Amino acid sequence: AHKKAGGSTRNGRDSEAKRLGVKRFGGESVLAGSIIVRQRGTKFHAGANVGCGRDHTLFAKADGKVKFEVKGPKNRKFISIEAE
Template identity: 55%
Template sequence: MAHTKAQKTVRGNRDSKSKRLGVKVFGGGAVIPGNIIIRQRGTKVNAGPGTMLSRDFTILSLKKGKVKFYQRRGEDFVCVV
């Protein structure tokens, strides 16, 4: 027979929705208090001065200013200046 018969769908064949992680405001970008700078899983980037790390590892701005990324001792940081 040339035709494939109807089959059950495979349970593990579904893909999860994307979580929209990543940098939301890049270096030099203007922010106000409460703006999300980075959405991440774990501390890929650490929170520096003028920022805070929320419980899901999102980095938020605490003051008005410009975003700056830098490295210290091999670690990545973001701050608001």
């Protein structure tokens, strides 16, 4: 029923995440990168996470959220190639 044995986190296997979409090349508005699911907001390049900063770039495409609270889950403001 409950949970016992004063223990912390619960484990299993190896993570199933990747680094798809380095971004500096074309990219249709879709989930750039993969780690955890369910998240929206970013509609372009919005790599911004606590640290030395983050980035992405060039690619004119309406929308394009991130994975979730990970590699810059925050939603910055627009960005395209330079001249789409």
